[PDB]
Ligand binder design. Structure first.
Ligand SMILES: CS(=O)(=O)NCc1ccc(-c2cccc(C(=O)O)c2)cc1
Ligand SMILES: [Cl-]
Length: 242
């Protein structure tokens, strides 16, 4: 079932922000959100698309493994961490768009379209340029649709090899301590209004998994840290993490 908890709106109001957090309790098969409407509103996935993009590149052999080095093309860009060599792990960590644009060009329109339909990913529409449609093309996905996709990935139920899914979940590793593990991916969509930030993934506990997907209005990059901060406040409130 689904349950709306508007008390979470305080975590956005507190920060002069608007957004949605969607939680899914895997053991109980129950979902929770502050805003049922926005939970089902579809936005550009931006760098959260690096999850499916990584899966497709690996399954087709465009990426051999997580150690393969993708050499910097020598073009200086405004994000210093992009001006260096990367592998799959670091390209995900630093959300290195130009590495994944090359992935998409090697994947090609036909195979990209087939794979996103096989994944049931969002509106499955890659209209636009093959190397930028997740930033300014026609593809759209909602917070609830992110969770449906992530749940299949967690259970190795996507229509790619188990190896491809294991590698991507490794690359999603964001935080780990004695109490929980977070595998997630951030997103930042600026090319089409409304500008939003994403954070999607899950929290692994000893005996349960909580999937999450959040997006929030992001008029400037100054508030990007709120994607994780707001999500963790909700997780703390619901006593999922200490
Ligand atoms: C129109 S703009 O000038 O406001 N945006 C340009 C811009 C700003 C930040 C990034 C970036 C890079 C790496 C990580 C993250 C993140 O959110 O984790 C955001 C990319 C591009
Ligand atoms: Cl791992």
């Amino acid at each position: 079932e689904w349950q709306e908890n508007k008390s979470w709106n305080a975590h956005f109001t507190e920060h002069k922000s608007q957004g949605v957090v969607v939680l899914w309790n895997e053991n109980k098969q129950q979902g929770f959100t502050n805003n049922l409407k926005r939970a089902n509103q579809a936005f550009l996935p931006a760098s959260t698309f690096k999850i499916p993009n990584s899966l497709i590149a690996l399954d087709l052999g465009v990426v051999k493994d997580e150690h393969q080095v993708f050499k910097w093309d020598g073009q200086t860009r405004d994000i210093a961490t992009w001006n260096r060599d990367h592998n799959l792990i670091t390209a995900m960590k630093y959300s290195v768009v130009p590495v994944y644009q090359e992935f998409a060009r090697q994947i090609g329109e036909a195979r990209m379209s087939k794979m996103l339909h096989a994944f049931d990913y969002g509106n499955e529409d890659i209209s636009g340029n093959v190397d930028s449609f997740w930033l300014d093309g026609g593809i759209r996905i909602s917070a609830t649709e992110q969770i449906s996709f992530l749940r299949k990935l967690y259970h190795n139920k996507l229509h790619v090899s188990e190896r491809s899914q294991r590698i991507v979940k490794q690359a999603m590793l964001t935080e780990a301590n004695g109490d929980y593990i977070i595998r997630a991916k951030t997103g930042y969509s600026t090319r089409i209004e409304p500008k939003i930030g994403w954070w999607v993934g899950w929290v692994e506990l000893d005996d349960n998994v909580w999937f999450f997907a959040m997006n929030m209005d992001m008029p400037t990059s100054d508030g990007l840290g709120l994607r994780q901060a707001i999500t963790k406040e909700v997780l703390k409130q619901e006593k999922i993490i200490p």
